[PDB]
N, CA, C and O atoms as a DFTB+ gen file, in Angstrom:
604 C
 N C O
     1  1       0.826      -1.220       0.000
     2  2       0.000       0.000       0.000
     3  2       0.857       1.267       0.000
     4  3       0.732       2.171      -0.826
     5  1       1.825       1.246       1.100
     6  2       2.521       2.670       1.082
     7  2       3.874       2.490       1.284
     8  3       4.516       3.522       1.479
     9  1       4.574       1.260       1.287
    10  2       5.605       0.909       1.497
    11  2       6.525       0.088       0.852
    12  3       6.091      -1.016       0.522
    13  1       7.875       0.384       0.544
    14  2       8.341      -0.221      -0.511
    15  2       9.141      -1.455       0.109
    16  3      10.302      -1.330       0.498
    17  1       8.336      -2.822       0.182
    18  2       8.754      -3.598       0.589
    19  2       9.080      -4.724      -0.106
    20  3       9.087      -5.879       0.318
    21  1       9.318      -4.374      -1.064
    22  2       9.769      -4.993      -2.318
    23  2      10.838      -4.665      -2.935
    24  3      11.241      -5.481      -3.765
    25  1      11.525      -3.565      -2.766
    26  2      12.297      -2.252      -2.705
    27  2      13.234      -3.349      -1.703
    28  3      14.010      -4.174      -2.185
    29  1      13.063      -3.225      -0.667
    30  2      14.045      -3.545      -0.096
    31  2      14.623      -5.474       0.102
    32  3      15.621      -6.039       0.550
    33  1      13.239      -5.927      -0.565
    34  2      13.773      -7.166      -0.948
    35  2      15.040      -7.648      -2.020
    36  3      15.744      -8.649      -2.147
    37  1      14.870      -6.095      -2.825
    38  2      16.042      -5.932      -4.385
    39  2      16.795      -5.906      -3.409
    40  3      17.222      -6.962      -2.943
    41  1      17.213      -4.382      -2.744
    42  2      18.293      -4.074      -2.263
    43  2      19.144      -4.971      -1.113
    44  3      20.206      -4.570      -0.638
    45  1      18.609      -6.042      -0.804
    46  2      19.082      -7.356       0.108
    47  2      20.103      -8.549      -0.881
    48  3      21.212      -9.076      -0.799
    49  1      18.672      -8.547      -2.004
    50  2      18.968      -9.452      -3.070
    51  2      19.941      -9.098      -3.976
    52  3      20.713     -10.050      -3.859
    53  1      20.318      -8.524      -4.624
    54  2      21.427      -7.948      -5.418
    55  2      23.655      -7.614      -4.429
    56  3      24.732      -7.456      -5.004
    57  1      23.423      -7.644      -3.364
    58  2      24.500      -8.126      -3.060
    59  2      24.507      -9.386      -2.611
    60  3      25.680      -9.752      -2.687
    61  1      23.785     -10.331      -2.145
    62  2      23.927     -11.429      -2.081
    63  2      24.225     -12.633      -2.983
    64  3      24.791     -13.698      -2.737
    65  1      23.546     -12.032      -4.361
    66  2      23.961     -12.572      -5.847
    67  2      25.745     -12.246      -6.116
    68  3      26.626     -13.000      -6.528
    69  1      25.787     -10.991      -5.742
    70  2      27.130     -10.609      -6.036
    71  2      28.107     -11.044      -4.987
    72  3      29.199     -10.483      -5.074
    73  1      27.961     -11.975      -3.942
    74  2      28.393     -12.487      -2.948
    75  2      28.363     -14.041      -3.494
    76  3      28.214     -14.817      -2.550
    77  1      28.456     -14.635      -4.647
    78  2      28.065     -15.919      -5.168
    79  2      27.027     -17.151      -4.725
    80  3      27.257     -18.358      -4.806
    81  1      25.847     -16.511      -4.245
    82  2      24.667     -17.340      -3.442
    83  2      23.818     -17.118      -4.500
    84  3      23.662     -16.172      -5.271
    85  1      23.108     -18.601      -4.322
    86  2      21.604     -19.158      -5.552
    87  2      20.444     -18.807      -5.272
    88  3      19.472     -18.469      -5.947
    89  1      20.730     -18.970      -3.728
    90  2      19.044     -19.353      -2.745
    91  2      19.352     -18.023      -2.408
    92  3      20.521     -17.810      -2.088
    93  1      18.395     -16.881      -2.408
    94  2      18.683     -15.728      -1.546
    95  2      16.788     -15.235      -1.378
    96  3      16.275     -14.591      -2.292
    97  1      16.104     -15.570      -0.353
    98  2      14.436     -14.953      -0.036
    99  2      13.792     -14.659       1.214
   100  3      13.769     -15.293       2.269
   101  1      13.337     -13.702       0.918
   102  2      12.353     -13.194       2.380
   103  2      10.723     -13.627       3.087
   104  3      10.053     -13.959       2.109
   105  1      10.153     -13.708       3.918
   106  2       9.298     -13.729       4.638
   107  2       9.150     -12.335       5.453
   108  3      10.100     -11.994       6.158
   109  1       7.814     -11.386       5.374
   110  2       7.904     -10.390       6.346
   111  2       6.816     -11.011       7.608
   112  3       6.392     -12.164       7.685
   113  1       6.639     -10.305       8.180
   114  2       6.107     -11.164       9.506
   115  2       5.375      -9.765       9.953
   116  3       6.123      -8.838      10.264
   117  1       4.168      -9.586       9.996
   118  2       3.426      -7.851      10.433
   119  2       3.243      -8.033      12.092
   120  3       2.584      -8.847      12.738
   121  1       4.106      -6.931      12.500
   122  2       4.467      -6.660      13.992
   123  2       4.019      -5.241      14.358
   124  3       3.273      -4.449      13.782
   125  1       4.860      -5.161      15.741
   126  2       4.358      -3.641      16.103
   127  2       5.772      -3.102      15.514
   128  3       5.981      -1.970      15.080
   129  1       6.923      -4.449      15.625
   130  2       8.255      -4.171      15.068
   131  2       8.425      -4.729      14.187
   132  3       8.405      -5.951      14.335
   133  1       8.769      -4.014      12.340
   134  2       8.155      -5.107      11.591
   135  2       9.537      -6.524      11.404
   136  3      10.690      -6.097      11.363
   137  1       9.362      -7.946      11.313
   138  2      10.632      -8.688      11.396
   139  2      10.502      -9.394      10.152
   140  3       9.415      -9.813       9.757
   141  1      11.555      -9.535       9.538
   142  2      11.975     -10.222       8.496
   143  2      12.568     -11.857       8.833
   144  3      13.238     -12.080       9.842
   145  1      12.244     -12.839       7.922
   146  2      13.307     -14.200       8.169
   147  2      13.672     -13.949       6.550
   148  3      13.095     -13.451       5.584
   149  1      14.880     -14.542       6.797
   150  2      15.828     -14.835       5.145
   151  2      15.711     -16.178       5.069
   152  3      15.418     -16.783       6.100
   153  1      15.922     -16.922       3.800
   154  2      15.933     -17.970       3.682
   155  2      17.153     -17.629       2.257
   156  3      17.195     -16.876       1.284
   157  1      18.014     -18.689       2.870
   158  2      19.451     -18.627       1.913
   159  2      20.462     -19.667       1.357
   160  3      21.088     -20.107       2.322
   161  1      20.818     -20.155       0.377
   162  2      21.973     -21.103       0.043
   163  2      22.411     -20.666      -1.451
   164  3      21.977     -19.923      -2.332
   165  1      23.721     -21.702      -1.215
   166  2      24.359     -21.874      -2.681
   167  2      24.731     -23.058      -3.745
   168  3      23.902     -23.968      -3.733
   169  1      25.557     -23.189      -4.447
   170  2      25.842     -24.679      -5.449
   171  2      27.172     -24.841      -4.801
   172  3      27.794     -25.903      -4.816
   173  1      27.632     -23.622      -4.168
   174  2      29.100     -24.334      -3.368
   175  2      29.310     -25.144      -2.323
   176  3      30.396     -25.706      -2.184
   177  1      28.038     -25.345      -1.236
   178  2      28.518     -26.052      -0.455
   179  2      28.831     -25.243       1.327
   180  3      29.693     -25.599       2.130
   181  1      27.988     -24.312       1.469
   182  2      28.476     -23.169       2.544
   183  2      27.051     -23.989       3.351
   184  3      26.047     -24.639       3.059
   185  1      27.894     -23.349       4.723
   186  2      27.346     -24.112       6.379
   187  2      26.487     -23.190       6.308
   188  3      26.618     -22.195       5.595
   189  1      25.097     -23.533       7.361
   190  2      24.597     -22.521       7.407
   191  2      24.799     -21.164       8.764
   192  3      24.088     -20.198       9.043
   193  1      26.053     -21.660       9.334
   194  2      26.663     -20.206      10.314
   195  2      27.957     -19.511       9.703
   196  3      28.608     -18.723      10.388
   197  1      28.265     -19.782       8.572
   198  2      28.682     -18.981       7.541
   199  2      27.698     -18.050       6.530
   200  3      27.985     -17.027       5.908
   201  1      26.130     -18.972       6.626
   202  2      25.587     -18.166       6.118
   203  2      25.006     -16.878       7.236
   204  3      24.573     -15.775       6.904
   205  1      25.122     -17.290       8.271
   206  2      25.051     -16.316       9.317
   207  2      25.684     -14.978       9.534
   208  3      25.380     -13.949      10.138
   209  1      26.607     -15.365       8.859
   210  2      27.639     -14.178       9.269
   211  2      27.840     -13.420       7.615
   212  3      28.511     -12.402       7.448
   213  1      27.223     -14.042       6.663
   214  2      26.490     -13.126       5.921
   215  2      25.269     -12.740       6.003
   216  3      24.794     -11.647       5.697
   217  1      24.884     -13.442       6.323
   218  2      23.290     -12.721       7.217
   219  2      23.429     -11.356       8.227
   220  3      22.718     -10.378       8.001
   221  1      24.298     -11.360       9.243
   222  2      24.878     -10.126       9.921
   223  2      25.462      -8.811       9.425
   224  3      25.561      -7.788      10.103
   225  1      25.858      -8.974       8.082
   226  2      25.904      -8.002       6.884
   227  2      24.863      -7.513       6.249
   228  3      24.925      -6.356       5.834
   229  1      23.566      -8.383       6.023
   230  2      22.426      -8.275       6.129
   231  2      21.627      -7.504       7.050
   232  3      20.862      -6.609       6.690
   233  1      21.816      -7.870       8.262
   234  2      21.400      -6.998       9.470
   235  2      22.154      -5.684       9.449
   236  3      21.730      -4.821      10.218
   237  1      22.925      -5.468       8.896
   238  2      23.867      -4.076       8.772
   239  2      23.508      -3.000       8.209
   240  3      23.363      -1.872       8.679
   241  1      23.311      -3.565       6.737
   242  2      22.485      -2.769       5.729
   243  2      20.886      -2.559       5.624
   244  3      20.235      -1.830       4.875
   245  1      20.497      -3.430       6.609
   246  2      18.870      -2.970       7.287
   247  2      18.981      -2.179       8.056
   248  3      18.391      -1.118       7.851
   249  1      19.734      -2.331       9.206
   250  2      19.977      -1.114      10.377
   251  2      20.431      -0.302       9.627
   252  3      21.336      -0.103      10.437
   253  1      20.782       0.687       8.458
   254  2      20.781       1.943       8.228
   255  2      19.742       2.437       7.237
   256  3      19.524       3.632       7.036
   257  1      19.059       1.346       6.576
   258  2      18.155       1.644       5.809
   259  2      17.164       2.491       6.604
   260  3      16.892       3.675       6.406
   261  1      16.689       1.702       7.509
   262  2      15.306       2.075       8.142
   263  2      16.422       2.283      10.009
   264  3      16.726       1.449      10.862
   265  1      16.709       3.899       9.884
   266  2      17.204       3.827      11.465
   267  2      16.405       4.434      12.941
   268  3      17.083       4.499      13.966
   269  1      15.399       4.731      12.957
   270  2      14.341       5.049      13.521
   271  2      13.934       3.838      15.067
   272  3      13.246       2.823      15.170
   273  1      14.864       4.720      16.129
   274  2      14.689       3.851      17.009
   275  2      14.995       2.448      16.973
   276  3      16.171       2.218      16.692
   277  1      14.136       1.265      17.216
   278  2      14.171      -0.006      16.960
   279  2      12.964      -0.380      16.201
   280  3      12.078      -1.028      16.758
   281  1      12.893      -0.115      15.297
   282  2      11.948      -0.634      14.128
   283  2      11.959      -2.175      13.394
   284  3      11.017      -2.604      12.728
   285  1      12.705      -2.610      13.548
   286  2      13.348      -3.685      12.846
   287  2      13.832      -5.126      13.424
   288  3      14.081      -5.215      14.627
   289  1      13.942      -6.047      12.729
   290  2      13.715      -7.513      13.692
   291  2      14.853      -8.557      12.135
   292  3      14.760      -8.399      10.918
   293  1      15.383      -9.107      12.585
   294  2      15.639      -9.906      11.690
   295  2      15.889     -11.562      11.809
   296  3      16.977     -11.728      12.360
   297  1      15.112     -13.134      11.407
   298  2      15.801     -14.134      11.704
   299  2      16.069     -14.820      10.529
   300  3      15.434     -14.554       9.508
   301  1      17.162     -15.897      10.555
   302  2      17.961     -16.578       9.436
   303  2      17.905     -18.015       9.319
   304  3      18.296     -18.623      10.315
   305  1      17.501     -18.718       8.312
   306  2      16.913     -20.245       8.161
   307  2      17.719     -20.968       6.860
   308  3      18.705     -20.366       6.435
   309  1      17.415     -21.960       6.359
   310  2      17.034     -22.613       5.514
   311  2      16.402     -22.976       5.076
   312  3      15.555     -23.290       5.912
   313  1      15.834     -23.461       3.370
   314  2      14.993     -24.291       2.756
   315  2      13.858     -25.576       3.569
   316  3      12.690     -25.907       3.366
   317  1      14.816     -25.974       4.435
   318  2      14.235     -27.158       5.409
   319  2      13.664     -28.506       4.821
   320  3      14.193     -29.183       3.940
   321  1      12.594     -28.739       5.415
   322  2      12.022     -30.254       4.798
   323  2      10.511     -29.487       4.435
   324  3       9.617     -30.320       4.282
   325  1      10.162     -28.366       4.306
   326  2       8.912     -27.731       3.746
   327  2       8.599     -27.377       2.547
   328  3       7.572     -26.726       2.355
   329  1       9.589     -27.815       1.318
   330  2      10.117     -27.745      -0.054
   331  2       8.977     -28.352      -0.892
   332  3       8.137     -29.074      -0.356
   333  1       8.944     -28.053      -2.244
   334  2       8.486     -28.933      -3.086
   335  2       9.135     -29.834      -3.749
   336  3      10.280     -29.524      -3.420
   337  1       9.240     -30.655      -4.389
   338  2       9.865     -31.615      -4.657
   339  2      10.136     -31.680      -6.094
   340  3       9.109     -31.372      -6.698
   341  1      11.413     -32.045      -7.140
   342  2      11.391     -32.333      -8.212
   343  2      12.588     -33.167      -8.740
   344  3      12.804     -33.559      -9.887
   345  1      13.401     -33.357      -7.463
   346  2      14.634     -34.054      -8.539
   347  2      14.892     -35.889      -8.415
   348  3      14.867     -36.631      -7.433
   349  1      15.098     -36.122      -9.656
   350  2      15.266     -37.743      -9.303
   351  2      15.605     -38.482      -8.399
   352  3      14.993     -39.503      -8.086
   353  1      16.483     -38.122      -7.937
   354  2      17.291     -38.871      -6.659
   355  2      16.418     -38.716      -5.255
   356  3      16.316     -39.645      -4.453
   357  1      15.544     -36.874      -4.988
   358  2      15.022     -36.949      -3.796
   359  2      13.437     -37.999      -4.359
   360  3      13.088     -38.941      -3.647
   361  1      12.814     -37.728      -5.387
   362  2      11.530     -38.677      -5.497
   363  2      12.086     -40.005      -4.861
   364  3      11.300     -40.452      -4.026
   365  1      13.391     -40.866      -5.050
   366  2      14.184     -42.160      -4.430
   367  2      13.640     -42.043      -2.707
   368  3      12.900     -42.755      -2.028
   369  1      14.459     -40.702      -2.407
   370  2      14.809     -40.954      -0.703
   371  2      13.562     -40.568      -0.026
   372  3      13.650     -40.253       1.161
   373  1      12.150     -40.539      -0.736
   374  2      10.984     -40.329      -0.067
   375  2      10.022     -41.422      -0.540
   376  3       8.816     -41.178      -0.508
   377  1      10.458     -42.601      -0.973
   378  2       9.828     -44.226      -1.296
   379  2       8.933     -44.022       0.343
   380  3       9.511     -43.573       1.333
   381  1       7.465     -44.450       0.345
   382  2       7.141     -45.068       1.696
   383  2       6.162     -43.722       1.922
   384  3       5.253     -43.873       2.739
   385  1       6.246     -42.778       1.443
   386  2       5.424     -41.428       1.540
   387  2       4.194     -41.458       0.464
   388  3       4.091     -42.098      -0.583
   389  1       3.222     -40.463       1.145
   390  2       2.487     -39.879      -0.083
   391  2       2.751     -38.625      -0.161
   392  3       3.282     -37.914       0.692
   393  1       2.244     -38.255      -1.554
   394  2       2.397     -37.269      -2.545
   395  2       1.319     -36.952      -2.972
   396  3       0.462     -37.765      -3.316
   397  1       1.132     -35.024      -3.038
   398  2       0.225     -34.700      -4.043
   399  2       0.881     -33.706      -5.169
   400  3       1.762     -32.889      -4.899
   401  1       0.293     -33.908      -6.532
   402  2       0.984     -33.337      -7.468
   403  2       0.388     -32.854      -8.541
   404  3      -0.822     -33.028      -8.688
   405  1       1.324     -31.997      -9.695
   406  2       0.225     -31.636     -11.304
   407  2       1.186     -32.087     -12.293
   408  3       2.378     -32.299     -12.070
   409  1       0.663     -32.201     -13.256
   410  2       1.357     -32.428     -14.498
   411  2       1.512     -31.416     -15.825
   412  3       0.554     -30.820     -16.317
   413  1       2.598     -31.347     -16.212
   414  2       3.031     -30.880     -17.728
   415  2       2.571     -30.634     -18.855
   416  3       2.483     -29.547     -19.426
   417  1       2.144     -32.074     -19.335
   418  2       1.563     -32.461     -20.330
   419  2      -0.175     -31.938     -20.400
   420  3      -0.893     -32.348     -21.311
   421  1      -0.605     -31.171     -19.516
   422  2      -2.008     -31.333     -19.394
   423  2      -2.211     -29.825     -18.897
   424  3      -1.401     -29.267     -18.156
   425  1      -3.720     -29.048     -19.524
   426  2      -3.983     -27.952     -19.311
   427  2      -4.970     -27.921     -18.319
   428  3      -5.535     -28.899     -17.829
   429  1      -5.191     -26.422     -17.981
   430  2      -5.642     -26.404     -16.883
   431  2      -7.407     -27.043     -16.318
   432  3      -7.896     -27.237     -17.431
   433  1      -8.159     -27.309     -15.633
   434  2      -9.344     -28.426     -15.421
   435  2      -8.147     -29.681     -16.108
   436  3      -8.385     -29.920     -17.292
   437  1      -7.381     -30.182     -15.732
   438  2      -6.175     -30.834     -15.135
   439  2      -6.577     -31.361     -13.702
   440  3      -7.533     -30.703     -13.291
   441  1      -6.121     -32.445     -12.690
   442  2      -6.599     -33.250     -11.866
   443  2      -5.661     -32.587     -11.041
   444  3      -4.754     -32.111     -11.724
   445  1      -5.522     -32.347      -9.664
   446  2      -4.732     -32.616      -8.684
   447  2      -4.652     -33.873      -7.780
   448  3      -5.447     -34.183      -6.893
   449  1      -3.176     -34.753      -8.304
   450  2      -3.354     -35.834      -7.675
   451  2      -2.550     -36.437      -6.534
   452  3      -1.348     -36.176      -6.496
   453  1      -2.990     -37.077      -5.765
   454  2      -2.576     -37.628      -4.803
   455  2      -2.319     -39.481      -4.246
   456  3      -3.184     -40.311      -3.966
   457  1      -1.063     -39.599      -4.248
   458  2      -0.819     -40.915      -4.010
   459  2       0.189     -41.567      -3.147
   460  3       0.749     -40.815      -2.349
   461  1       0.542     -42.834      -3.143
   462  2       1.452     -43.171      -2.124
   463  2       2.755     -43.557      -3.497
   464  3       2.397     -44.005      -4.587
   465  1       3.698     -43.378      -3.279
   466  2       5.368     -43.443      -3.935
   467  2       6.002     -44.603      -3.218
   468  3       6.196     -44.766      -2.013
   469  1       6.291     -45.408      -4.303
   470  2       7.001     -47.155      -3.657
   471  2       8.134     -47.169      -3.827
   472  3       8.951     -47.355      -2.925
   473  1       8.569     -46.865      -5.696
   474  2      10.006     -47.255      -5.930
   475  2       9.950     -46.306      -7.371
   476  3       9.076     -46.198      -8.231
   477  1      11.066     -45.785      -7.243
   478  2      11.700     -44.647      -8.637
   479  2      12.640     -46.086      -9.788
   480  3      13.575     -46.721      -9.299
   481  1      12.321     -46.257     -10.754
   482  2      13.268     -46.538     -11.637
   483  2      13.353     -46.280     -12.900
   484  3      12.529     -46.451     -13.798
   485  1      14.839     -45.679     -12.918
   486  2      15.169     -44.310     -13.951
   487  2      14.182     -43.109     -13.902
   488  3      14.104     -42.362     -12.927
   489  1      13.288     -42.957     -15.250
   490  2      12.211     -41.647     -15.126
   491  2      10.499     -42.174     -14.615
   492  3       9.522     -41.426     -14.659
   493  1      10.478     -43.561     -14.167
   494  2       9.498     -43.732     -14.419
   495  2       9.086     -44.184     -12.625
   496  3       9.232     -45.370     -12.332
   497  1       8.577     -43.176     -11.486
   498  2       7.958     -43.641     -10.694
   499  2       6.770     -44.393     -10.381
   500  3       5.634     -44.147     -10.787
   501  1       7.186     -45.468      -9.513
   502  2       6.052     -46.710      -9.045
   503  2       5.029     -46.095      -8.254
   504  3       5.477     -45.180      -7.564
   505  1       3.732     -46.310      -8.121
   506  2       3.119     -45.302      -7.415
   507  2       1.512     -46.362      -7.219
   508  3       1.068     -47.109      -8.092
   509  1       0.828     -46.099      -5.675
   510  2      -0.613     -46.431      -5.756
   511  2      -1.291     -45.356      -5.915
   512  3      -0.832     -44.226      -5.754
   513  1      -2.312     -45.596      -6.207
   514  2      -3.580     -43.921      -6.809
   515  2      -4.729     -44.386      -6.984
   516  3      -5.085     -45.170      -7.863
   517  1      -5.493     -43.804      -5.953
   518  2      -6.787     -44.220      -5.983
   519  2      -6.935     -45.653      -5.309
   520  3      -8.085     -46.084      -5.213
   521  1      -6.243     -46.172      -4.994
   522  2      -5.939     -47.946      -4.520
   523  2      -5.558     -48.529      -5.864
   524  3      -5.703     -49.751      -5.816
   525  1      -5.159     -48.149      -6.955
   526  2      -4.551     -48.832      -8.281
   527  2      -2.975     -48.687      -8.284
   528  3      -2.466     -47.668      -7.816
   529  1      -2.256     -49.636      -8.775
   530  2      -0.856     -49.281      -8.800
   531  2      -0.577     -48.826     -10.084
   532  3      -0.413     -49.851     -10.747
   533  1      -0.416     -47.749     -10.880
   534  2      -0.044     -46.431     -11.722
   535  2       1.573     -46.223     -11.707
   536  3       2.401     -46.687     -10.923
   537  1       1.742     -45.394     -12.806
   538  2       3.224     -44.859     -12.673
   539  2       3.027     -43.418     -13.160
   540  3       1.995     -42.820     -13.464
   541  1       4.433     -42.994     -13.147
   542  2       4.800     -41.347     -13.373
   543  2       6.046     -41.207     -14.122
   544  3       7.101     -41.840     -14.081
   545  1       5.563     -39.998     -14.968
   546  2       7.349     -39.935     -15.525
   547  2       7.450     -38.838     -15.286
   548  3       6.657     -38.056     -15.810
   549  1       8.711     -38.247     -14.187
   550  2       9.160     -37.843     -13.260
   551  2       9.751     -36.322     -14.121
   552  3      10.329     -35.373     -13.592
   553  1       9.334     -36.508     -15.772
   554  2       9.450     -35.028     -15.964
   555  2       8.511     -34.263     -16.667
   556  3       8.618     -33.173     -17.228
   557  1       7.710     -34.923     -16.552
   558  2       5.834     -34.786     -16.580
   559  2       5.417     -34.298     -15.428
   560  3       4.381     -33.643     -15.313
   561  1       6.470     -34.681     -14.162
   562  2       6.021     -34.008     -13.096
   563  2       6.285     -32.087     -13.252
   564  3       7.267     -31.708     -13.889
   565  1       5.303     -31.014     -12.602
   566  2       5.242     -29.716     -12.809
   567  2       5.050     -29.300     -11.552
   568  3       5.479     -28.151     -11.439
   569  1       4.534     -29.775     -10.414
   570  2       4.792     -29.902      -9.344
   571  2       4.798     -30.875      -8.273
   572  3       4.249     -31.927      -8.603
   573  1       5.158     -30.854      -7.334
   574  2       4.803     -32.089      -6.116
   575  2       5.436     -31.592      -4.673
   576  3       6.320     -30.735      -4.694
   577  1       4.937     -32.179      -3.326
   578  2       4.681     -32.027      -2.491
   579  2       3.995     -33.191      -1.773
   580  3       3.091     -33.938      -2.145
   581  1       4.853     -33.108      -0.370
   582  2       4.990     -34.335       0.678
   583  2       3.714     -34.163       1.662
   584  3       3.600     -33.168       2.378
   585  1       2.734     -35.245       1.640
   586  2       1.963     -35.669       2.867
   587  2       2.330     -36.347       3.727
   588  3       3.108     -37.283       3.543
   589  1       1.786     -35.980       4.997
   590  2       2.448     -36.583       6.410
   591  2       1.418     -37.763       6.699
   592  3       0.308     -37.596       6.194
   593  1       1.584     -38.753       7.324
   594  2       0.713     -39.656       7.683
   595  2      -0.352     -39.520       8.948
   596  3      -0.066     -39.209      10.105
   597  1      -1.668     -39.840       8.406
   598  2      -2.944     -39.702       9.362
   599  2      -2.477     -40.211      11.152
   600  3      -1.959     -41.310      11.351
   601  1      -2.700     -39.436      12.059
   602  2      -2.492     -39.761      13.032
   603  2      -2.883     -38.976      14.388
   604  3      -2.588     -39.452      15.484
């Protein structure tokens, strides 16, 4: 509405690119103090209390942006296990789960589907659906996402 908080998502994002990082994104959080979380990585291989202490450079260039008392809040994460899913090897290390997902090949009034995942081999995942055993080819997949078990 009146605030450029998008503005300052660039100005976060553009040295962090130039700092050689892939993963660089925000969450705002509406407070009486407003707080930000980052969410951050790279293809090199960095810890995430290295990413900390670029994160604290982060906190640097916020504290002068906006310097008005204590206005400002900042916390620092990772990707986690709350991801969507797409690459061959992780569809493997989540055999025993269900899944809901969309497809590629197909326009929209398209199904959203949901099933249990047995066994990946090569492009073609093993899968039950509906209580039928079905398959998938894993680059037909357009999205997907992990269900937790009833309990």
């Amino acid at each position: 509405m009146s605030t450029l908080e998008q503005k300052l998502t660039e100005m976060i994002t553009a040295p962090v690119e130039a700092l050689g990082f892939e993963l660089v994104g925000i969450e705002f959080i509406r407070g009486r103090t407003s707080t930000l979380r980052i969410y951050i990585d790279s293809e090199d291989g960095i810890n995430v209390d290295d990413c900390a202490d670029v994160s604290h450079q982060v906190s640097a260039v916020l504290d002068v942006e906006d310097p008005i008392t204590v206005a400002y809040n900042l916390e620092v994460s990772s990707p986690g296990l709350d991801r969507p899913l797409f690459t061959a090897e992780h569809y493997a290390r989540f055999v025993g789960e269900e899944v809901t997902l969309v497809l590629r090949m197909a326009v929209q009034n398209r199904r959203k589907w949901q099933g249990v995942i047995k066994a990946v081999d090569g492009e073609m995942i093993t899968v039950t659906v509906e209580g039928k055993d079905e398959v998938f080819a894993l680059s037909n997949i357009q999205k997907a996402n992990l269900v937790p078990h009833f309990a």
